[PDB]
Write a protein that binds this DNA or RNA. Structure first.
Lengths: 98, 197, 172, 106, 136, 51
RNA sequence: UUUGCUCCACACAAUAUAGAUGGAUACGAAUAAGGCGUCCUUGUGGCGUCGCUGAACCAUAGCAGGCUAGCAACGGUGCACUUGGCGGAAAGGCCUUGGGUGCUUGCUGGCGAAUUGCAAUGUCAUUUUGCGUGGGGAUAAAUCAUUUGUAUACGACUUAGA
RNA sequence: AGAACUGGCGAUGCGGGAUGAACCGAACGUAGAGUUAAGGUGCCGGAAUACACGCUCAUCAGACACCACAAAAGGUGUUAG
RNA sequence: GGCCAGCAUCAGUUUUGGUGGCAGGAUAAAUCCAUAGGAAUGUAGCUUGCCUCGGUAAGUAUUAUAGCCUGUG
């Protein structure tokens, strides 16, 4: 549906498996190998409205373990992923390398 | 970029600074001008005294009390040049003029705050070396301003207090640099230098 | 009138039955484009020979480049101009890097010091000064002195901010 | 943290206008930090929101928001042209305005 | 008795004086003055930095305190030889001017992840400075 | 009901001028010329650089 | 003139806005010259270093920012108090002492976030006034009328009368 | 004041010349977007306190066609010849 | 199934960048390389005359312990 499937991970910053639009997202340069993840199960019909449904909770726990293993490889990435991005005084987004 | 910008009027040109401030006032930026008695005007002293006398004789014939008001203070002379650069007869132009404060010397709390200059308005950066210039404080005294010695006495007292503050600040800054130099030769100092810090 | 170029233009004075193969006059024209260069060529042949644009054609137009475009030379230029009163002849020397660049500054200098527009200046000759001490103007002699070093005892560097937090310094 | 700003501050200068005639349909916005049309090209299409306070309670809040977008550059000093859904009240000449980073192209 | 007069050292426009182009296509490269055309135009050559030999205006360049012996009107091959012999590019990189310049593209090249790491590192360093400053 | 401009709409650019498909095959606009190099006579060079 | 008036802590309301959303971050002076550091016979001194913009500096990580466990430090910082000093140009601010308490991301952890469902400023200011709780304080005048004539067209002015 | 040719005003708004029946640009259904004319880009005022070469200091400088005035004659003022 | 918006893929009009392949000129001119000739705002050397053991000062000297210019390829 032209959207992006994202994860925090939920254990790191509290952002679960969610769906967002690509136009409201700034893509940075930090890269993590996602070639250990079972993303093909999730699709458009997976996010159907029809509190929090119980079955999707363990899907969040089975996906985040495949990322936090590699997050611990590069130092300070876990603390980086738990910190909110913000613009400070003097910051110019037209020259800020992301 | 700042809530209130304090501009030091010393060494500036009355016309090039007013046009800078008038544009900033219309954009919604509050401007405070201090030391208006040290403003500079291009041309010799006799040129500007004759120009003010031409302005001084302009008054309404049948009632002098409702004609052009010839203000003598250096702050108001700079204000008169700035007032004609703003559409002051409209509501938008009146609101811009309430964002401006001009004083002789450096008044209270604006004396404890940082003062800036306008690079495209300094006399040293616009005038050819050799051109004659006039000081606004001397010109105002020759046309009827009687507070030159009062401001000069208060300004001399202020500089003594600010010199004592700078001695404490300069000594404290040297103590900070000694601890920052000892912070070098460490792991966190070399890692910061790799990232341009 | 613009950033100049140097052209060579050849007219022919179109053949009649009585006179085939004419003399093929040639000039060097300083202009911005080929259209003005051909126009200035006909303007001068109309001042020297019984020929105009309708009575002749342009055989060839070629752009002349500097042989050494990056070697500083001294150029002695003779000009004839029209003033508000009459016509006068000048000789000036310009120290520059090419014939085209030296001509470009001459039009700026002629307009600045004599109020002479482009339409009122005729370039008689642009010639190179081969030897030192053949330069006759003092403002060119100054830069031919041995071991020339001159400072700039003032520094107005341009700024980009309306406000600066330190007073500028003109050290140099 | 101390700052939660995800936008850049701007200033409503005036409408698109001639010497004596103005066009309220197009507003001129000065974005801080921008001084060239080349740097202003990054902000093309970015969403503009004007936050102002009202008196009557509308939906449990006294703040109403007027939305817009950056259309093109204006001049050689980084000023940009803006068209909002509804034109600005012309009393906001010099008022602060918010330019967001979305829709993002980075 | 002393006859002191202040010297007030200045950067002279001279043959061999190294310039730094600030406006134009180069915008930050190093060149050397070859010959002086007039009071406002000079001939420069930046063969090691890639600057073509050209007649430039003095307002587009800023003189550097570096100077090396160069003959007047020396060609590009001659200029490049004396440039490497004097090691102009090595003296320039050791100056605080270039180290301040090279610092500002490094900050401009910082990614969002690196900008977070600089924040963390400055917090560790600030702890040591505050401890050392509060005990003396 | 609406004029579609060629040179930006390739489908219209293929409707008119069917040779445009062939024009893109050998690319027809970057063709390398045969390397000449015969030199002009001396009288042309002396005249060009004449005073 | 039916418990009114004023001030402080707070609670509920309305009213008002030329436009808060990391920090207005304090020598002076010169510009054909200076800043800083250091030495010295303390000078218009010697030496070193810096500029070429604030593109800086400080601040900045946590549910707009939670719940807790420690380690290393005796710091950093907020708040209510308190000690002392300075500041009158529009001072109404600045510096500093003592402890109390909270936080600390300087370092190592353990849980909590989702469903606000793909963006809808997502409310976070202070301004005056009103109204109630209760913690202190204060206990008047002016005008008309009468009168005076240093005043006066009329108002005004100048006086007087428990 | 009286003729010749043509274009205009009168019968004509619009952008520009601060201002004007004639000048410059351009002529007009109702709207949107883009690009320009003439004229402008220190501020009033939308747009470079752009760049480049020079000239000028004026104890009544100068600043833009129509246009709202200035001369003969002078100056060891300064610049170029 | 209205009203107000977002995104995607398109069409029409248009604005602002990045980048590729070619064709022309003196088949750019230069730089560069090779060769010959030459000059001074005359490099080393030589020589002369002053001088805090060397730094200058004017004669010689056409590339040497610097270089440049011009022609040709």
């Amino acid at each position: 549906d032209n959207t992006l499937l994202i994860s925090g991970p939920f254990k790191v910053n509290g952002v679960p498996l969610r769906r967002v639009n690509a136009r409201y997202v700034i893509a940075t340069s930090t890269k993590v190998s996602v070639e250990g993840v079972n993303v093909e199960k999730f699709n458009v019909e997976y996010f159907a409205k029809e509190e929090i449904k119980a079955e999707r909770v363990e899907d969040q726990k089975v996906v985040d373990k495949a990322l936090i293993a590699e997050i611990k490889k590069t130092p300070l990435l876990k603390q980086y992923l738990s910190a909110s991005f913000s613009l400070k005084n003097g910051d110019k987004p037209h020259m800020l390398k992301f | 970029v700042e809530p209130v910008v304090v501009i030091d009027g010393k060494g500036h040109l009355v016309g090039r600074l007013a046009s800078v401030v008038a544009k900033q006032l219309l954009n919604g930026q509050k401007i405070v001008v201090v030391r208006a008695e040290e403003l500079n005007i291009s041309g010799e002293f006799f040129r500007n005294k004759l120009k003010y006398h031409d302005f001084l004789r302009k008054a309404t014939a049948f009632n002098k009390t409702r004609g052009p008001f010839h203000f003598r203070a250096p702050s108001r002379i700079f204000y008169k040049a700035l007032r004609g650069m703003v559409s002051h007869k409209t509501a938008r132009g009146k609101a811009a003029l309430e964002r401006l404060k001009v004083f002789e010397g450096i008044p209270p709390p604006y004396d404890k705050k940082k003062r800036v200059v306008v690079p495209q308005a300094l006399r040293v950066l616009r005038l050819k070396p050799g051109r004659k210039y006039t000081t606004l404080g001397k010109l105002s005294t020759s046309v009827g301003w009687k507070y030159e010695d009062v401001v000069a006495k208060l300004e001399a007292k202020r500089k003594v207090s600010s010199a004592e503050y700078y001695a404490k600040k300069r000594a404290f800054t040297k103590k900070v640099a000694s601890a920052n130099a000892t912070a070098a030769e460490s792991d966190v100092a070399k890692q910061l230098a790799a990232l341009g810090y | 009138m613009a950033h100049f170029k140097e052209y060579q233009v050849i007219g022919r004075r179109l053949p009649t039955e009585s006179v085939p193969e004419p003399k093929l006059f040639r000039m060097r024209i300083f202009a911005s484009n080929e259209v003005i260069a051909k126009s200035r060529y006909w303007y001068f042949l109309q001042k020297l020979h019984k020929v105009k644009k309708a009575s002749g054609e342009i055989v060839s137009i070629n752009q002349i480049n500097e042989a050494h475009p990056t070697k500083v030379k001294n150029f002695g230029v003779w000009v004839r101009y029209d003033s508000r009163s009459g016509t006068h002849n000048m000789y000036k020397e310009i120290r520059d890097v090419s014939r085209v660049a030296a001509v470009e500054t001459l039009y700026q200098d002629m307009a600045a010091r004599h109020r002479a527009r482009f339409r009122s200046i005729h370039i008689l000759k642009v010639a190179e000064i081969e030897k030192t001490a053949d330069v006759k103007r003092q403002y060119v002699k100054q830069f031919l002195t041995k071991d020339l070093k001159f400072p700039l005892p003032h520094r107005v560097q341009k700024s980009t901010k309306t406000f600066s937090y330190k007073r500028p310094s003109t050290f140099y | 943290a101390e700052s939660h700003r995800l936008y850049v501050k701007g200033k409503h200068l005036s409408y698109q206008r001639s010497k004596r005639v103005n066009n309220p349909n197009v507003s001129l916005i000065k974005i801080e930090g921008v001084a060239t049309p080349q740097d202003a090209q990054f902000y093309l299409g970015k969403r503009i929101a004007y936050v102002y306070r009202a008196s009557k309670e509308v939906r449990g809040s006294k703040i109403r928001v007027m939305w817009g977008k950056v259309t093109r550059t204006h001049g050689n000093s980084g000023v940009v042209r803006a068209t909002f859904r509804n034109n600005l009240p012309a009393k906001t000449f010099g008022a602060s305005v918010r330019i967001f980073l979305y829709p993002s192209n980075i | 008795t002393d006859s002191i007069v202040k010297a007030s050292n200045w950067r002279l426009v001279e043959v061999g004086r190294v310039v730094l182009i600030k406006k134009g296509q180069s915008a930050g490269k190093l060149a050397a003055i070859v010959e002086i055309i007039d009071q406002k135009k000079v001939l420069i050559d930046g063969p090691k930095a890639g600057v073509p030999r050209q007649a430039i205006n003095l307002g587009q360049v800023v003189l550097t305190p570096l100077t090396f012996a160069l003959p007047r009107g020396a060609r590009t091959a001659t200029v490049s030889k004396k440039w490497a012999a004097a090691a102009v590019c090595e003296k320039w990189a050791a100056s605080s001017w270039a180290k301040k310049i090279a610092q500002r593209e490094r900050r401009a090249a910082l990614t969002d992840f690196e900008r977070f790491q600089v924040m963390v590192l400055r917090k560790q360093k600030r702890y040591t400075v505050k401890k050392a400053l509060a005990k003396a | 009901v609406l004029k579609k401009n060629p040179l930006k709409n390739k489908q219209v650019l293929l409707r008119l001028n069917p040779y445009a498909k062939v024009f893109a095959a050998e690319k027809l606009g970057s063709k390398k010329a045969e390397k000449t190099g015969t030199k002009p006579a001396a009288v042309f060079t002396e005249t060009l650089k004449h005073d």
